[PDB]
Design a protein around this nucleic acid. Sequence first.
RNA 1: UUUCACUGGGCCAGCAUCAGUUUUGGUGGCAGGAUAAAUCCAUAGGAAUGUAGCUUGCCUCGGUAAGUAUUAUAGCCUGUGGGAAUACUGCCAGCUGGGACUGAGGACUGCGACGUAAGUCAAGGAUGCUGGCAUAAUGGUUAUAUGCCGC
RNA 2: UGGUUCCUGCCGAAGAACGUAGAGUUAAGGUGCCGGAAUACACGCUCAUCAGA
RNA 3: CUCCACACAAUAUAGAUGGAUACGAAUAAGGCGUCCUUGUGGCGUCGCUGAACCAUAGCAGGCUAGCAACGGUGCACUUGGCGGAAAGGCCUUGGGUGCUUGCUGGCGAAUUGCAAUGGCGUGGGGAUAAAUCAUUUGUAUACGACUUAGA
Lengths: 88, 184, 171, 114, 128, 106
Amino acid sequence: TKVSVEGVNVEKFNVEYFAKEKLTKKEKKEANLFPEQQNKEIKAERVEDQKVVDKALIAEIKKTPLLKQYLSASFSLKNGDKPHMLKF
Amino acid sequence: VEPVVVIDGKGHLVGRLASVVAKQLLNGQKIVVVRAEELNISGEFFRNKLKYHDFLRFRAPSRIFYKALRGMVSHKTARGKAALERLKVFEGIPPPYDKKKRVVVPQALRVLRLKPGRKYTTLGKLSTSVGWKYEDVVAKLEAKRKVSSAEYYAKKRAFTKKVASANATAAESDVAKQLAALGY
Amino acid sequence: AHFKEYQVIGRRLPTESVPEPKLFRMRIFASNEVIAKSRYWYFLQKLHKVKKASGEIVSINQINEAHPTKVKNFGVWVRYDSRSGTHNMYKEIRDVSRVAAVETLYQDMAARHRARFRSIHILKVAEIEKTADVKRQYVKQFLTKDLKFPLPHRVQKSTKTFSYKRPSTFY
Amino acid sequence: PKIVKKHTKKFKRHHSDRYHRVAENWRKQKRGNISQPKIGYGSNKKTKFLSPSGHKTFLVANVKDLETLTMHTKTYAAEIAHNISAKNRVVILARAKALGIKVTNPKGRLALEA
Amino acid sequence: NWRLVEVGRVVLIKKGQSAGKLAAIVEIIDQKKVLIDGPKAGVPRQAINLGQVVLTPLTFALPRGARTATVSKKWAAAAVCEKWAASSWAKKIAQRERRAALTDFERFQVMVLRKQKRYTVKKALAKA
Amino acid sequence: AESHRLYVKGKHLSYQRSKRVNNPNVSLIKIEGVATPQDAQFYLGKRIAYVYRASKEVRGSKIRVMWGKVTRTHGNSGVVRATFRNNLPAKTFGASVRIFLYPSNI
RNA sequence: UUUCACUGGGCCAGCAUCAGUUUUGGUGGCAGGAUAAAUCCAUAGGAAUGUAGCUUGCCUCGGUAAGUAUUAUAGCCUGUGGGAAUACUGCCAGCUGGGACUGAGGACUGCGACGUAAGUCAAGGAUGCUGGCAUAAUGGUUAUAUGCCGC
RNA sequence: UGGUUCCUGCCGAAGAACGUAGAGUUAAGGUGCCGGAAUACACGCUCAUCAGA
RNA sequence: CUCCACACAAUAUAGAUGGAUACGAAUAAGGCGUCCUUGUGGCGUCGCUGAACCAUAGCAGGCUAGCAACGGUGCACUUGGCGGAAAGGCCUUGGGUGCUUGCUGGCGAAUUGCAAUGGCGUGGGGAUAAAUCAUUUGUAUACGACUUAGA
């Protein structure tokens, strides 16, 4: 099952975009031996990229019937499911 | 595919069914073998009677089939003992297994393996002929079971007839045609 | 294995002052050409005093069936050795092709007579053309008008472990 | 490199468990379920004499012996002899960490107080 | 009621190069072997052992030893292609082929439509 | 909702053996619903896990896993050879072992 | 000494691209035969396990039977002529896929190949990317258990 | 007569010549179960009141 | 059966992670449906595998919004019946109270950074129905044992 990627301008972000960040000053001496946990949040730019891709992707999805609910539901293997026979 | 496999013994051969079950217990499949008295032996009654005789120099059919099965498994090993501990064998079908489906093993069927025009042997008659004095008790319970099972099946057929009527009136709908489009 | 017809010709060697001997032709049923040539020499020595060093093979050939669609009827002459004594035997075979009839004949001779492929010496396979020249009763059993019968062996290979159906030879 | 060992276990005499008087060293007998020593089990010549750290060991008695491993630090590793007194072992450890040579057995006959 | 091996018995080769093709027994060889041809299905005229084939309850009239052009004529005039397709067994065979042909989004739509049909049936149930 | 299985369960049948000598390195697996070696060609190279449950809690759980992979077929019935990282304890004959779809060709 | 920026060892994995061994597929083009034989089409004879027709007899207003009847209101076979196709067998220095095992060697030299060129390369043996790891990662020791072998 | 003390390598008489491994392929032998591997396929024969393998 | 002390527990052991999903016989015959002349009747169907059927969306399954129906479904009750071969289960009344994906909504998921599964025992007290020893008998007795009888 296929959808059109053409609505989305994906090309901007790259391999370097997913590079996990680093620290400096040896984590600023661990804030002088006192740990701090505010760094858990996501950068907003990642969220904005997700929204920009998501709009043009949902616009593709809504033309096809039942595909949103297909992506929402997960997948498992039932009894008698034989994946060598199961054409996908 | 099933946790506990319930196997009817009516119309089956001794050794072929014993080989199949002995393989599956060493494979780890839990097996109850029911209506054991209706197992069938190749050859006439008299040959097999002499075979039990010269072996004997336990009378229940379950003990007989258990003997045959235990011969095929390496019984002295701990693994073989666990495999035998997986097994249950019963003459007739006692509860709770009366309310569940009983499968058959086609490669051990009498009517498929035996050529027509051959004598076979009923295990219950053999056991009674060698001193198992309980066969009349068996058929008495089995008659009551067949009565209640005929009642159950008569109810089941009427209810599934109602289900057939409901599926018939559910037909011609567009959701049914979309299932037809998908194949169901 | 599955055999093949072979036109095999031998001409035992034109010597000095003997040009062009008589080009002896036979037809061998064999799985390959090699054992066909070996059987050809094995008959040619029994024909007269040749050796494989004495002569040569002219032409090894496979020959197909002209009409492998029609069921033909055959009368076959065989000689072979019930080891001490020999005797001929005449069998009648209903078969589509010649070489399949010879295949089934070897299977039947090995079944009923314990005879090997080397012990069996084919004399002649020829089509019986018209009916009632079928001397054997069992091929004549299939020469009746409008012949119908049920299948024996309704037992088939079930290919699975357990059956929910309690199956039946329902034929 | 990747050290192949060719034999994890040891080579014991036949019936060595059956008697307490019989030792466990290899002595040639004079079934096939006993592994017998032979030259096929001899290790690869590059991989021979290598620690799991990947070094070749070298016994060191004093500081002058330790200074002989000055150039070959990444190849060898110093091991202090069993009979070195504890005054000398700390001097050897300080000198070795100055030289940057991996000591195979630190903390022998020694503790860290305060 | 029995099927019989006979001329004009349309058959189905369950095992082989056909693995299911409608053919017809043109002539018998013995109790073991027969002559068949399936020129509509595409399997050629050949001898076959009877184990490799199954009999269908359909039949028609076919001449003894009939040639392939005559065979296809009597096949089409029999119109047993339609009689075969009308049979529920061939419908089941095409169904089990179509079930293998399914896609996962198709199978999910099967799930959804089974839910909706079950809703409608359980409304139709428990009122009658 | 009701099921979460992303694997095929299959029985640890045995070790590779002659009548007298068994190889603990190669293990024998019966994958359910597989009778032909051609179906077993689909299962080649696939990542296998034996899941078992320990008494102790090693790292946040009491359940431990051995891993390994299918190497090749074995016999006519679609019985499948397997090689693990550590070999099996052989009291797991006839045990349910999970065979995962990755590395997926499809 | 201080600011700032970059970076880090070892092991175990997974993936990619290779190379070597191997296994299992899918697919193409050839070449030979009786230049496949067949089949199909064209023609001529033939016969029956004789189709249509006709005659006759018993008989449910028409079924049977047994003669005729060689195609008719079925056809078959054989002969001859035309045309392919396919089977089988062999070849491809044809294409393409999956799985397993291996990574010896250690500046360059050699044979190559692609490249107008400079250069590149699957070409004189594996490199690249990523993950995990100090209350480690991981490894070992024992005792028991399982299976197989062992007088 | 009985006993006669460390290791390894090399040389060494009167179905398959075996260093240590990994991978593949096989000889013989098998492929109901023990037991690994077709309760394959095909054709015939034998029902034995202790066949036969 | 009960009061203090401390060791796991809210779990699993030969291998849980959708469902063990129930006529019987016959097989050179069955079944199903239907009709009548209820039969060894007739008609049609079916098998030729469960490759079936049933269940199955939602954070390992979140929080809300309505549309429609009087469905489905869980749990605790409640009503009545069935089940003894080892019944230990089945079925039903009636409400309650959840979910409902039959349909349509609206917010949350991330960074886990590309795979690495991810009530039961002890130890110390308290209470209780009996049993035993002891006495006694002799239908018993080498001795046990047997066997009376005794608040």
